[PDB]
Write a protein that binds this ligand. Structure first.
Ligand SMILES: Nc1ncnc2c1ncn2[C@@H]1O[C@H](COP(=O)(O)OP(=O)(O)O)[C@@H](O)[C@H]1O
Ligand SMILES: Nc1ncnc2c1ncn2[C@@H]1O[C@H](COP(=O)(O)OP(=O)(O)O)[C@@H](O)[C@H]1O
Ligand SMILES: [Mg+2]
Ligand SMILES: [Mg+2]
Lengths: 379, 366
């Protein structure tokens, strides 16, 4: 009775019992957002989907992009989505995971970091890294919310390939397969999400449209990384070309190795599209405020010569950023809360960018509008 | 090298290493919100505070309120805030925690549920409870982020009193003290928050003003519970009187689980709400459920004239984040409904100002 009332849970039990604490809502939500629809392409519409499901997909995708930082020679990511077989796989090149036994934990590294909770190569903050990874949960969460989860990685350096399958919400695992290897390194994560945990029958149009858009995001946000979807190379060559998809006048600057900015006029209020370490910061954050307010200030002062949030409300801004040890207001990670002083870099836009921005069709809209309101009489 | 690169953490290490995942930001934020200032009382202003520090306080306060559901005879909560001694204590009456050894976990229950992670009496969802407690973290998180954390609880039923102190971020514990007991049951949690973890020198005005407001919220959101702050009874007798403090209005206690107040807003849509005594500052489906019901009867422009206050008891509530400012459970799974009476609805009809739309018989001319 005392023993029935007061309980202790294992870590694994707890995640399944309280999923929203780890992956966010396991219920449907409906909201407006950009997705990539088949035949139509990038568009803004109402979408109904489960955040938790999006999240576990996003964890594996971001992990692939994280590997770019670990190994700049990485050049490709391949994504496969198969609704009929309820099957998703995410492949990447560049250095594989060390296929070797961990001397402290007494298991092979891949099995450790995909099969045991609280495991990461990003737990040392002294190293100052710009990965999306930070907590050591992501890959495990995908595993816990999958009926089958397969890890395959190949390490030339250790001359071996590792392959292992987990099943039933990481409740059991198949035998670990090792083989000799000396090819080019790859990692492939293949999983079948547990749709009953998300109250879904299949990977419907909406969730797929989101997942597909993330592939495009990765193509846009990473450097010198080709992205394939299913089989086809995505026609996105860097951030500029990514931004072009959203448009049918645009100002651009690659400020430095960690910041890239595009700006155009908005007629629907302040808009932002942004990324931090290849994470989609859909609700913005201090990184967007940092760049935007810098532009706002300069444009307000030009307007003063002949109003602040009003200037900002005419802006559509696109930001790709690499931030050290980023922080977010929730799981979901839609809003990045780290202060600019801790970013690890600055982003001072060039005078050329600012000058082009003063043109751009913007200070003009505001001035015409303000001249107009002076002409209006209410009768 | 492999072993230095790829690391595994204990649960405890992880919480201290990645606190914001468990308690929210351990950095200052600045935002506008309602607080209770000394001499001035309830007011809306800019506030600078650390959310994580607010949370650990909140966890212990909500736990005290949760005990009401466990024991309806509970009548009192006493809160003590002492900035100088960096000392907070939260006392409640009603049934104490069973002072007895847990047969499976092989320790006394109070030590188990305040000293071990992932421990709760709210893990059975068949029981359909309306507590704020759900995850079995809260009390531990307060302990983990305190230099000293003391649990004292007294159970007539088991004829014993338990007392134990943890120290250094739950890194060590003192000896457990047991004594015979036959008085009236109480539980008192007394802690000193680890201010260095929150980069603070003391419990300043702002955080104290937040904490004090929560005391008032509890007085407002719980039923037949007197609340004391530093020895003074708070003058809040139920939700209506709580709402009045904001307004120096139409009301309905719809049922045992829903209470609603509505007035006009001139500042856009405003909401003040609670789910199981948790402060849902950013709202949720519970506020949408009540509000949209009102809106529909009179029709976003309507909604933007509303200032609504909602106190709800929800079964197994769910939230965006760890700050629990936004409650996400869908109305089908609430465990109750909240159909406002025709009287309320009628009193609500005295916002309707077709007056602005009418007067929008304007002519823009040059
Ligand atoms: N595609 C990949 N390539 C190389 N390493 C990977 C890949 N995916 C995951 N990892 C490694 O395994 C860990 C995955 O853990 P994850 O749970 O995603 O934690 P993190 O918060 O570190 O990203 C990482 O720390 C990383 O070292
Ligand atoms: N004031 C109290 N009176 C009685 N029991 C308490 C009190 N505070 C905490 N508890 C018990 O200890 C547990 C506290 O754990 P907590 O960490 O707050 O998780 P949760 O509240 O989610 O159950 C509760 O489940 C409850 O059984
Ligand atoms: Mg990761
Ligand atoms: Mg609690």
């Amino acid at each position: 009775s005392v023993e029935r009332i007061y309980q202790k849970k294992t870590q694994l039990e707890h995640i399944l019992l309280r999923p929203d604490t780890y992956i966010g809502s396991v219920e449907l939500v409906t909201q407006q957002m950009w997705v990539y629809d088949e035949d139509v392409g990038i568009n803004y519409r109402e979408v109904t989907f489960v955040p938790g499901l999006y999240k576990i997909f996003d964890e594996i995708l971001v992990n692939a992009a994280d590997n770019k930082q670990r190994d700049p020679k990485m050049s490709c990511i391949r994504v496969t989505i198969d609704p009929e077989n309820n099957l998703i796989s995410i492949w990447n090149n560049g250095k594989g995971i060390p296929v070797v036994e961990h001397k402290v934990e007494k298991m092979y590294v891949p099995a450790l970091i995909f099969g045991q909770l609280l495991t990461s190569s990003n737990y040392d903050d002294d190293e100052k890294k710009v990965t999306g990874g930070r907590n050591g949960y992501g890959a495990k969460l995908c595993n816990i919310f999958s009926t089958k989860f397969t890890v395959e990685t190949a390490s030339r350096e250790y001359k071996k390939m590792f392959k292992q399958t987990w099943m039933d919400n990481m409740g059991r695992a198949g035998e670990m397969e090792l083989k000799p290897f000396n090819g080019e390194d790859y990692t492939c994560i293949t999983f079948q999400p547990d749709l009953s945990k998300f109250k879904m029958q299949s990977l419907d149009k909406d969730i797929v449209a989101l997942m597909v858009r993330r592939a495009y995001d990765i193509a846009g946000s990473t450097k010198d990384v080709k992205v394939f979807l299913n089989g086809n190379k995505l026609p996105v060559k860097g951030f500029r070309s990514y931004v072009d998809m959203y448009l049918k006048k645009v100002i651009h600057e690659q400020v430095n190795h960690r910041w890239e900015v595009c700006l155009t006029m908005s007629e629907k209020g302040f808009q932002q599209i942004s990324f931090v370490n290849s994470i989609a910061t859909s609700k913005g954050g201090r990184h967007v405020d940092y760049v935007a307010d810098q532009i706002v200030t300069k444009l307000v002062d030009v307007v003063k010569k002949k109003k602040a949030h009003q200037v900002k409300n005419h802006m559509w801004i696109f930001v790709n950023a690499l931030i050290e040890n980023p922080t977010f207001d929730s799981q979901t990670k839609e809003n990045m809360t780290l202060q600019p002083k801790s970013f690890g870099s600055t982003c001072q836009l060039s005078e050329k960018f600012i000058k082009a921005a003063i043109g751009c069709g913007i200070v003009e809209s505001i001035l015409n509008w303000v001249k107009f309101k002076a002409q209006v009489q209410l009768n």
